[PDB]
Design a protein around this ligand. Structure first.
Ligand SMILES: [Mg+2]
Ligand SMILES: [Mg+2]
Ligand SMILES: [Mg+2]
Ligand SMILES: [Mg+2]
Ligand SMILES: [Mg+2]
Ligand SMILES: [Mg+2]
Lengths: 119, 119, 119, 119, 119, 119
C-alpha cells in the first residue's frame, strides 16, 4: 500500500486564456513541489470554470522513460487523471497536463511544469 | 489524502476459460472483502497469463449510483484500473472487472463479484 | 441463413438504481431462457428511461471462449447490440449487458445473467 | 422476429488494388440485388486476403435518411458489420462498405454499390 | 513546400437527403477536377446545414493504393479533413467523403466522386 | 489558397530519453521560428527512431485561444499532424508536440516549444 493524494485542478480564463490554480484538500493553493516517500497515487480532479469544455486527455512528460511516475490512468469523462508510482524510483520529474477543449481542436497544456520528487 | 491499495489481477486459463486470482503486495492470495475507512484509491494491476490479449475496459456495477465508489480511472494500455473514493459514502457495493480480448469480440467478466465495504 | 430475433432492453430506475425489463416483439415481458436451434442473430434494442445517458458498450461473459456466441456487434450510438451465432455450437452460456452512463464513470451491469441454450 | 442472412466479403488485390467478391452460405458468388420481405439482419463477414490489414469501419449510403436500413452494427475487431431492418420500410437503397487499412490512412470503399430492395 | 488549397463542403438537405455543394475561396461553386502540379495539401472544411450532426470520419477511395494521395488527416471535431500529397505521384484518383451523423448509425457518402489529377 | 510547408520530426533516444530534431525539405536541421505570411498548412511528419512506438496525439498550446493556429488535423496512424491557419491572425504562439508511446502510458512532450509568427 501507499499514500493517496488528491489535488484539484481549477481552470479559469484570464484575458481569454487558461489559468491553472491547484488546491489541496483544505482548499489551500498548492505551494512548491510534491515530495513522495511511499508508493502510491496522486489523483488530479478537474474543476473547469472556463466554459471551453476542457477534458483531461493525459499527462505529458519531456522525460517519459525516467521511471519516476510509472503509469497514468484517466477517467472516461476526462474529469480525473492519476499518476501512479508502483516501484518508488528515486529522482525528480516534471510534467504538464494535456487537455482537449470544445471550442477548437488544439490541445491545451498547463504552463508551469509540476515537479515530483523522491529523495 | 487517504490510503493507496494495490491488488494484482492474475488471469490464467483452466479448461479454456478465465480464472481470476487476486494477490496483494506480499503475494498472498486475497481473502475476504475490502473494508475501507479512509478515502483513497484501489489500484488493480492486470497480469494476463491467458495468451488471449486481455485488457481492462472498466469496472461494472449492478448498483452504479450507490456512491460507494465515486469514479473509475483506466490506463491507456488497459493494464491498470483504479477505483476512486472521494467522499467516503457508507455502505457496501459489489463489482466485476470487464475486459476485452483479442481472440473474439465478446467482453470478459470476472465471475465472483468483489465486495467493498465502509462501516 | 437463420433466424433474426429482436428483444427490447427497457431500463428504468427504482430507488436510484437500474432495473432491466426485457420485452419481445409482442410487448410481452420475456420469460425463461433463449433456446436457439438455427444459426442467426439476437438483436437487443436499448430503451433507456433512466435519464442517466445509458449506452451499450458490449456484452460480457464469464466463459467467453465457450463458442456458444461467436461474436458481438454494436451500433455507433450504443443503442443496439447483437449476439451472432455463426457455427451453431451446442451448449449453454450466460451473459450480462455492459453499459456506460453519463452520470459517472462506473460501468453498469445487468444483474440477472441471460441464458442462451442450444440442445 | 425475421430472417438472418449471412454474406462473406472476400477482398483480394489485383494490380495492387482491392477486389470485392461476395459469397453466400453455399460458397456461391452472389448474384443480383438483395430482396428483403421480412424484418431482419444481414451480416457481412470480412475475409481479408489483401495483406493490407483491412477492417470494416461502417457502411456508407448516399441516401442515409431513406429508412430502408435502420441501423448498422459493427464488431470491435472490424471483421463483422450488420445491416438492421427494424420497421420494413418499402423501397430500394444502395450502399458501399467503408474499411480502414494498415498500409495508409486512406479509407477503402467497395466500388459497386450493393442494392437492397423491399417491394 | 507546396500549395495549400481550401475548399468548403456545404451540405444541405433536399427531399430529406444530403446535397453536397463545394465552394472555393471566392465563394464560387467549384467547377471540374482538381489538377495538382506541386506537392501540398487540400483542406476541406465542413459546413453542415443539415441539422443531422454530420462529421467527417475520413475520405474513401476505390483505389486506395494508387499513391496519388499519400495520406488523410482529420480534425478531432470532424470539421476538417485534408488530403496530403508528399511525393507527387502522377495520375488520377477519385474519392468520396465519408461522414457520421447523429440521426442514425449509417455512414454518409458524398455521391459524385471528386477527381484529383496530376499530368 | 496558401503555402503548404513540410517539416520532419525526427525522434531518437539519448540516455534513454527522447530527442527531437526537425528537418526541412532539403534535410537541413531547422533554424529559428516559423514566420507565416499567407494562410496555409504546416505538415509535420513523424520519423520515430526510438523503438518506443511513438504516435502523434495532437499539438499542445499554453494559449490555445489566441487564434494564431486555427485548427489541428491528425492522421489515423499518428504519423502526421498539421497546423491549419485559415484566417491569418497576427501575432505569435508557441506549441509542443504531444505523443503516445507503447512502452508506458505517459504522454511524451517535445521540450523546446516551437514558435510560429505572423508580423
Ligand atoms: Mg518507477
Ligand atoms: Mg461516494
Ligand atoms: Mg460457436
Ligand atoms: Mg426502415
Ligand atoms: Mg504519392
Ligand atoms: Mg486565426
Amino acid at each position: 500500500q501507499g499514500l493517496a493524494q488528491f489535488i484539484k485542478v481549477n481552470v479559469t480564463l484570464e484575458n481569454g486564456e487558461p489559468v491553472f490554480i491547484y488546491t489541496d484538500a483544505n482548499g489551500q493553493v498548492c505551494q512548491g513541489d510534491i515530495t513522495v516517500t511511499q508508493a502510491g497515487t496522486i489523483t488530479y480532479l478537474l474543476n473547469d470554470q472556463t466554459l471551453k469544455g476542457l477534458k483531461f486527455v493525459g499527462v505529458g512528460f519531456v522525460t517519459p522513460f525516467d521511471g519516476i511516475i510509472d503509469a497514468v490512468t484517466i477517467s472516461s469523462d476526462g474529469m480525473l487523471v492519476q499518476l501512479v508510482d508502483l516501484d518508488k524510483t528515486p529522482g525528480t520529474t516534471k510534467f504538464q497536463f494535456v487537455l482537449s477543449n470544445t471550442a477548437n481542436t488544439l490541445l491545451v497544456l498547463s504552463p508551469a511544469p509540476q515537479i515530483i520528487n523522491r529523495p
